[PDB]
Design a protein around this ligand. Sequence first.
Ligand SMILES: NC(=O)c1ccc[n+]([C@@H]2O[C@H](COP(=O)([O-])OP(=O)(O)OC[C@H]3O[C@@H](n4cnc5c(N)ncnc54)[C@H](OP(=O)(O)O)[C@H]3O)[C@@H](O)[C@H]2O)c1
Ligand SMILES: Nc1nc(=O)c2nc(CNc3ccc(C(=O)N[C@@H](CCC(=O)O)C(=O)O)cc3)cnc2[nH]1
Length: 159
Amino acid sequence: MISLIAALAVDRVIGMENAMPWNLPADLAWFKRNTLNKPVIMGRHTWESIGRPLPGRKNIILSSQPGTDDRVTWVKSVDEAIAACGDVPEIMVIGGGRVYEQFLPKAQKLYLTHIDAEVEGDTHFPDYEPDDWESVFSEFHDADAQNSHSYCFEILERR
Ligand SMILES: NC(=O)c1ccc[n+]([C@@H]2O[C@H](COP(=O)([O-])OP(=O)(O)OC[C@H]3O[C@@H](n4cnc5c(N)ncnc54)[C@H](OP(=O)(O)O)[C@H]3O)[C@@H](O)[C@H]2O)c1
Ligand SMILES: Nc1nc(=O)c2nc(CNc3ccc(C(=O)N[C@@H](CCC(=O)O)C(=O)O)cc3)cnc2[nH]1
């Protein structure tokens, strides 16, 4: 009902310098499939990192300050972000670190890509209690010519 989606390297690293230290087209395709036609909520830094709207999704940006682009919807608290989604089945929270930790307790579902990459970064996915979560889907993929690490797509349900 609220879901988080994220891609985690070793030690739960999710970013460095406001970009993601890997480039895996197969994972971005997974992200697009699981977010298409659903509202996405992101923090202002992630909005900057992405650099443009995500098409085919209502884009909701969290910021304390006035917004700077009317192609997306701007909100000033977690409460307001959820409301702005409108009355839907599934809201997708798309990060970054600070936003994930605030939505985690409200979330029923995690879509996590576990990437076998050793990255030196400055942003992490939450240190979540694993006992809270049932793994209901896993798909491991070897690296290939397009994807320069192995990666595993998991979906976790809150127990
Ligand atoms: N690996 C992945 O899947 C993934 C996914 C997403 C992002 N990332 C990475 O994560 C990094 C960005 O994460 P962190 O630094 O993300 O920033 P963030 O969580 O994207 O953005 C944080 C900002 O959002 C606003 N915000 C957050 N909570 C708010 C609240 N309750 N009320 C009002 N404003 C709120 C604030 O903006 P103001 O300062 O304007 O108030 C603020 O904290 C980047 O490196 C990005 O590449 C990785
Ligand atoms: N699993 C997962 N992987 C990610 O890379 C990811 N990235 C973010 C934040 N950053 C981004 C950055 C770019 C795009 C992006 O360009 N996505 C396209 C896919 C098109 C393609 O295949 O290149 C999209 O339309 O979603 C999405 C999120 C949030 N959650 C994630 N979750």
